[PDB]
């Protein structure tokens, strides 16, 4: 729908999501992408014009995409999808300047329940991963900005 909300500055699509952690904080909940069937990501989605805050969007998408209920325990701030040839400064190399694709507002959630039936339960897989596994999945998914969000969480990395 054209019910989506965009940054008035950069025109980046405004998305909220959840780093959903087990109470012991040893594992994060990950879902498969709908387009890229084999790629493991975290629950997230576009803010809608009616929604009063990012927490609403985040908890709605965590239910819809992952059948996961929990309490938001931290605001993990923002990360950007910086995807659209190169510009070399002679001490480093960078991609040619462009506006961000997406601006993500992430929250840490403590999982309280996982339900077997949820809206996207037939079009996605869903599973708990240790930090090391989760980190490798996000690299495999080519989503370093989601890994940045994961890294700000209280997930045990040792
Ligand atoms: O192509 P990507 O990787 O940039 O991401 C995809 C993202 O998929 P992802 O790869 O993040 O898993 C899709 O979401 P999905 O995972 O639910 O299929 C999402 O579709 P959407 O309109 O439902 O938007 P959300 O991703 O719930 O905010 C967007 O897809 P669309 O091309 O079908 O409209 C998004 O695309 P962008 O506009 O580029 O952000
Ligand atoms: Mg999504």
Numbering used by the authors: 20 to 103, 113 to 186
Lines from the paper:
The yeast diadenosine and diphosphoinositol polyphosphate phosphohydrolase DDP1 is a Nudix enzyme with pyrophosphatase activity on diphosphoinositides, dinucleotides, and polyphosphates. The longest helix (α-1) contains the Nudix box (GX5EX7REUXEEXGU), which displays a β-loop-helix-loop structure that binds the Mg2+ ions involved in diphosphate moiety orientation and catalysis.
We have performed site-directed mutagenesis on Glu80, Glu83, and Arg32. Both mutants on acidic residues produce inactive forms of the enzyme or those with very low activity. While Glu80 binds Mg3 (its equivalent in HsDIPP1 also binds Mg2), Glu83 forms a triad structure with Arg79 and Glu80, fixing a perfect orientation of these residues. We crystallized inactive DDP1-E80Q in complex with 1-InsP7, showing also bm2 mode for the inositide; however, there is no Mg3 in the active site as expected, and, in consequence, the diphosphate moiety only fits in a nonproductive conformation. The DDP1-E80Q mutant precludes Mg3 binding, and, in consequence, it selects only the conformation of 1-InsP7 with its diphosphate bound solely to Mg1 (bottom). Mg3 is only present in wt-ScDDP1. E80Q and E83A impede the metal coordination and, in consequence the catalysis, but they have no effect in substrate binding as seen in this section.
